[PDB]
């Protein structure tokens, strides 16, 4: 019993963080087989990032001007290229430490944990969600730029995020491991806003049902509803649309629990409209939404 | 910015979890150097739970009887040992990724990391703190007996907990590394019922500190209090006293906000009386106690 938000264990990813310098810059790469990956604004001094034109800085730039250090031992760069937003830095040698892994574009919604990390050095490990506005809330402190996002699948890791920049709002943006941001931001300092940050209706669901399974039952009402009408509600409350694809995610878990999957949205329903009542549910007094149906399944397995 | 709760990289502690097998009964070990520490209750069947007599059910076990695996691989075990509430079992191989390490016995309300294990493979990390009433609110599903709880200072690890329980009140309950039990419980399926859960004080200022710190200032307010006066409201709401050894731990944040630690106080004595009237602090709808002051700084810095 009990529910906590986990993130995967982070060794793997640990033995792949090296440090990058270029100039006066600092931050993060990720060290995969002969290759290390970092955001290309490694390349800006903080003067440039008001507009940098990256092609004009970077033909500046030789394989002897990327100082990358793992730990306390210097790689040897023997190329470079920009991909997108990212560098890649051909290295002559293999990560010994390179876990079976893969790139992934995750979609608004899904969650993974981040290892934040300060010059190469990995400092904690936390689990979050892409936000349908595909911003993070995260904790990224001055250096923490190239950190990165991931899921582990047994074996392997899933590489899905690496952070490059905080807006001004205070929430954090970053691309996928091809360099391609999520959502609309560039990696320039300049006003971005993000859009309206919506809750993932599918994972407060997934959260409920984990509440019951748990024995936080005093929410479960005796109504039900229907899609449609549940969706005029989300629409009012900032509620992502629900689908019969979000349903038919939910399937096992409204099979483990007895518990219609409109049975749940009515009780969802309740709470949006009448609040929680100076209660809570799985310790928390508001809707959680950074569990997916997954996650709840892994947890509770 | 941002703020979020950070378990610390588990790298170090992945490298150390084994299989311990005794008769029927699978748990987690924690193999450093040329010793596996895992809860004594290994040699119980889920019968010898109501009533355990361990001296007696270790006398029917010798070295052979107890087998130990570090991922795919069987250790040999040259010595056994009862200290307190583990089993220390001798094999004839050091861990070859022991970690430079610790062993220390933690006070309540201080927060550590736990690395979720089952059948010695790493699950999860997440962070949490020893409650007031000796208990931790975790995530333990069946197998995940001795998983550890940590802290890490640069390159050593101080290990502080080792999961033994569940109480039937869904809360968790375990022993230092040395066997000995946090609070008043024992390893044996019986009624214990832990006492008052009681907030950590000191904790939730450090909190109130942080949000501060990254722009949540709506709860600040023109008031100041006592230490007598706040800690009446304090014994009401079931809130920890506040002694000046903790106002001391308070200081570098109070420095750096220029809020004096009893007009934060104050603060916190009127979200204590009138709640939160639906708002948030830090993402937030209560007040939260399970970040140190030292957290604070470490995550700030
Ligand atoms: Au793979
Ligand atoms: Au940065
Ligand atoms: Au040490
Ligand atoms: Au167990």
Same mark, same amino acid.
């Given at each position: 019993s009990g529910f906590r938000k986990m993130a995967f264990p982070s060794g793997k990813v640990e033995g792949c963080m090296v440090q990058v310098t270029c100039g006066t810059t600092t931050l993060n790469g990720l060290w995969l087989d002969d290759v290390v990956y970092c955001?290309?604004?490694?390349?800006? *001094?903080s003067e440039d990032m008001? #507009?940098?034109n990256y092609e004009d800085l970077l033909?500046? @730039? /030789? #394989?002897?001007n990327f100082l990358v250090q793992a730990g306390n031992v210097q790689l040897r760069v023997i190329g470079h290229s920009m991909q997108n937003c990212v560098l890649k830095l051909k290295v &002559? *040698? $293999? #990560?010994? @430490?390179?876990?079976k892994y893969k790139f992934v574009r995750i979609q608004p919604g899904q969650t993974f944990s981040v290892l934040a990390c300060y010059n190469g050095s990995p400092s904690g490990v936390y689990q979050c969600a892409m936000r349908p506005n595909f911003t993070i809330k995260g904790s990224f402190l !001055? %250096? /923490?730029?190239?950190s990165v996002g991931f899921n582990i699948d047994y074996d392997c890791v899933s590489f899905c995020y690496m952070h490059h920049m905080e807006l001004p709002t205070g929430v954090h943006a970053g691309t996928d491991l091809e360099g #391609?941001?999520? %959502?609309?931001?560039?990696?320039?300092? *300049? $006003?971005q806003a993000a859009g309206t940050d919506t809750t993932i209706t599918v994972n407060v669901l997934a959260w409920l049902y984990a509440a019951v399974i748990n024995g &936080?039952?005093?929410?479960? !009402?005796?109504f039900t509803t229907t899609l449609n009408d549940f969706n005029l509600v989300a629409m009012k409350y900032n509620y992502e649309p629900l689908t019969q694809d979000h349903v038919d995610i939910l399937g096992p878990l409204s099979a483990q629990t007895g518990i219609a999957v409109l049975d749940m949205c009515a009780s969802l329903k309740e709470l949006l409209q009448n609040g929680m009542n100076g209660r809570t549910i799985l310790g928390s007094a508001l809707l959680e939404d950074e569990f997916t149906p997954f996650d709840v399944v892994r947890q509770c397995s």
């Open positions: 955001p290309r604004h490694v390349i800006c *001094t008001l #507009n940098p033909i500046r @730039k /030789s #394989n002897h &002559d *040698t $293999a #990560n010994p @430490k390179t876990p !001055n %250096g /923490s730029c190239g #391609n941001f999520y %959502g609309p931001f560039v990696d320039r300092q *300049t $006003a &936080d039952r005093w929410f479960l !009402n005796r």
